[PDB]
Amino acid sequence: MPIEDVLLDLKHKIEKNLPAGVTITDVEFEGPQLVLYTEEPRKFADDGNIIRNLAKELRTRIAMRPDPPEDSISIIEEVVSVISSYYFDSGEVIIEAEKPGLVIGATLREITKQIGWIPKVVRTPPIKSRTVKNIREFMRNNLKERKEILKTVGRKIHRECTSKDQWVRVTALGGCKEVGRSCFLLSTPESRILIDCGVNVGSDENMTPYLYVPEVFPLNQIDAVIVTHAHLDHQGLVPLLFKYGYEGPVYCTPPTRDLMVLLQLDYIDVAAKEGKKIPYESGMVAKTLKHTIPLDYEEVTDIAPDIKLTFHNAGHILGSAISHFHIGDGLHNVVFTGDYKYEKTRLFDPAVNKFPRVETVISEATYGNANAFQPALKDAEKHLQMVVKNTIERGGIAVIPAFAVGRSQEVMIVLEESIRKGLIPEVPVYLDGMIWEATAIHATHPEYLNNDLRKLINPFLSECFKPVDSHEARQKIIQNPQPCVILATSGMMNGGPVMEYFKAFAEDPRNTLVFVGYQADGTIGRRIQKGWKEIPMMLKMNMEVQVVDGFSGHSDRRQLMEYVKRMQPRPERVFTEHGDEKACVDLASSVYKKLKIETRALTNLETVRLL
């Protein structure tokens, strides 16, 4: 292996840059990173400048780690505040403390001295995520395979370039002139990157992206998969890639990682109970997680010999990213927005549109229609409060379909506040179908929220919220109807517990059904919102329907236009996707017309050349 020889060259380079007294054992490419192993980690914990002075002269991302838990936990517990938990990752120990300042750098220095492990102290989450813990245990149980997969991915990233050609192009494999099954191929002569691989949203659930075409098969030709955010319509078929023999990395933000596992296991579990087609088994979710490499916002990451990736805040859901790809030594820069919201919301900061360079933007277009404004945050809230207030005060209960992550959380923040300020009546807000576990995960990723929510996490711990995922518990809400609010899955009524709630509450006109975001073509929710009163399960709906389209987590028409208009630098092309046909085409020609930027709607199975 002539890659060993570039790692030796790197070892020796490093060794003559190191200060006296500091040694390393080995140097390895592990995923995106160059990793230095050391028998003296304390020395790197004390002087953070070595890694600075090292990365500097090497022009790359470098981590150090200890040369290779139950005795560590015990040695730490003597040496060290009210510690909730520990997690031994990279030779780090995460410590959860109610008072984190008391554990931190004199004392952190003394702790590393005695135990070697590097302490990362974190404030004890108000809520326990059972998913975060299961993933951590699963990663420990699979450390050997994981290290080996990182080595393989690493060496492939640092293979040498072999074409004397330069070009860049994007092929669409789903998510064009439709909402659903987003999946795109960015390719160069050296590299093929897959952005997203979603499930369909609409009439037919089985429909996948066009994965069987020469541009994607054989899957081993794929350098990486990027997941822009955790929504099923963007990650849901990533495990199918593995089923079909993909063996590279999946890159996403840390919260995406956690949500993706949650939503995936739930997808296939619900699919079994409801009796639909099950695209992959749970073993493929495990395989996807073993190949997942999280990256934080703003962390520039070599994912291929000629491609650097940087994630930025998208403002859509927890961990949602805008994906910037820097190709070559400044050959081209392309941004895939994923789903985004160019506006500060209760949970997140606005989508980012400042980049060192951007020649091409591929943007979503969900509210892309000329018509498609959505009410201001403040007005949407008052509207929700009034619909819910009125429903309760007259003895009805308010069913609000939602996704586990996305529309549910913003709705909860509004409700808790409203009840707290005596603006909706004190009444139980039931939460069904993984909403609550999804919310727990937010607590574990404070850095992915905006400043105000960060300081607050406390809304989500209100007495009002009552979770339910027991089926036995569901029936008690049903058998004793009693004025309340129900957030329940799934967000477009194509299935899930919201259908049980609906099957039983749709008859009394006193009740209300609250749509808080768009409902896509072909969905049950969409069909209801069009004033169909006969819904197949066949039972007739007399219940009030209100639409308070303020919590979708997407940029409205104005915001889509402002995002591109105010982008720095200004891009030379934009392409549109993730909207119904008219939405993509309307937004595209609007941007050409108003902003004079050449823009056009993508079509599934077309390939466009960027350079």
Binding residues for Zn(2+): 229, 231, 233-234, 316, 339, 578
Q: Which does 165 bind (CB under 5 to 8 A by kind): Zn ion, its own copies, none?
A: its own copies
Q: How many angstroms separate the Cα of 568 from the Cα of each of 20, 299, 611?
A: 45, 19, 20
540/609 with CB nearer its own copies: 609
DSSP string, 93-133: EEEEESSHHHH--HHHHHHHHHH-SEEEEEEPPSS--HHHH
- Residues numbered 84 to 103 that lie near its own copies (CB under 8 A) are none
Q: What are phi and psi of 25, to 5 degrees?
A: -95, -65
Residue 607 binds its own copies (CB under 8 A): yes
Two tokens, residue 566 = 């105010």
Binding residues: 229, 231, 233-234, 316, 339, 578
Q: How far is the CB of 576 from its own copies (least distance, A)?
A: 16
148/572 with CB nearer its own copies: 572
Strand order in the sheet with 33-38: 27-30, 33-38, 62-66
Helix, strand, or coil (residue 433): coil
Using CB under 5 A as the binding criterion, the count of chain residues that bind Zn ion stands at: 3
Residue 604 binds its own copies (CB under 8 A): yes
Q: How far is the CB of 201 from Zn ion (least distance, A)?
A: 8
- Residues numbered 211 to 240 that lie near its own copies (CB under 8 A) are 212, 214-216, 221
Residue 339 binds Zn ion (CB under 5 A): yes
| Residue 13 burial (CB count, 10 A) | 13
Q: Which of 129, 131, 171, 494 binds its own copies (CB under 8 A)?
A: 171
Q: How far is the CB of 117 from Zn ion (least distance, A)?
A: 37
Q: Residue 584: CB partners within 8 Å, gap ≥ 6?
A: 176, 177, 365, 368, 576, 577, 578, 601, 602
Using CB under 8 A as the binding criterion, the count of chain residues that bind its own copies stands at: 21
**Bridge-partner residues for 29, per DSSP?**
34
65 vs 38: CA distance, rounded Å: 6
Q: Which of 231, 257, 326, 442 binds Zn ion (CB under 5 A)?
A: 231
194 vs 216: CA distance, rounded Å: 9
381/577 with CB nearer its own copies: 577
Q: How far is the CB of 212 from its own copies (least distance, A)?
A: 8
218 vs 96: CA distance, rounded Å: 44
125/175 with CB nearer Zn ion: 175
Residue 359 binds Zn ion (CB under 5 A): no
Q: Which does 189 bind (CB under 5 to 8 A by kind): Zn ion, its own copies, none?
A: its own copies
98/598 with CB nearer its own copies: 598
Q: Which does 606 bind (CB under 5 to 8 A by kind): Zn ion, its own copies, none?
A: its own copies
Q: Which does 329 bind (CB under 5 to 8 A by kind): Zn ion, its own copies, none?
A: none
In 465-521, where does DSSP find H-type helix?
Answer: 471-479, 497-505
28/196 with CB nearer Zn ion: 196
**Bridge-partner residues for 400, per DSSP?**
487
248/491 with CB nearer Zn ion: 491
Q: Is the dihedral of CA 240, 362, 33, 111 positive or negative?
A: negative
Residue 458 binds its own copies (CB under 8 A): no
Diameter of the chain measured on Cα atoms = 80
Residue 332 binds its own copies (CB under 8 A): no
Q: Which does 187 bind (CB under 5 to 8 A by kind): Zn ion, its own copies, none?
A: its own copies
The answer to whether 182 and 194 have CB atoms below 8 angstroms apart is: no
Residue 233 binds Zn ion (CB under 5 A): yes
Residue 573 binds its own copies (CB under 8 A): no
Long-range contacts (CB closer than 8 Å, 24 or more residues apart) made by 246-249: 246/219, 246/220, 246/222, 247/149, 247/152, 247/219, 247/220, 247/291, 248/153, 248/156, 248/220, 248/222, 248/223, 248/224, 248/291, 249/31, 249/149, 249/153, 249/224, 249/225, 249/291, 249/292, 249/293, 249/303
233/266 with CB nearer Zn ion: 233
- Residues numbered 148 to 167 that lie near its own copies (CB under 8 A) are 163, 165, 167
609 vs 170: CA distance, rounded Å: 7
Q: How far is the CB of 192 from Zn ion (least distance, A)?
A: 22
Q: Which does 233 bind (CB under 5 to 8 A by kind): Zn ion, its own copies, none?
A: Zn ion
Q: How far is the CB of 602 from its own copies (least distance, A)?
A: 10
Which range, of 126-134, 362-370, 560-568, 603-611, touches its own copies by CB under 8 A?
603-611
163/542 with CB nearer its own copies: 163
279/517 with CB nearer Zn ion: 517
Q: Which does 339 bind (CB under 5 to 8 A by kind): Zn ion, its own copies, none?
A: Zn ion
Residue 244 binds its own copies (CB under 8 A): no
76 vs 70: CA distance, rounded Å: 10
Which range, of 185-193, 230-238, 358-366, 437-445, touches its own copies by CB under 8 A?
185-193
Q: CA neighbours within 13 Å on the CB side: how many for 70? A: 0
Q: Which of 86, 88, 210, 297 binds its own copies (CB under 8 A)?
A: 210
Strands 429-432 and 92-97: unpaired
Residue 606 binds its own copies (CB under 8 A): yes
145 vs 149: CA distance, rounded Å: 6
What letter does residue 33 receive in the DSSP assignment? E
Residues found near its own copies in the complex (CB under 8 A): 163, 165, 167, 169, 171, 187, 189, 192, 210, 212, 214-216, 221, 603-609
Residues found near Zn ion in the complex (CB under 5 A): 231, 233, 339
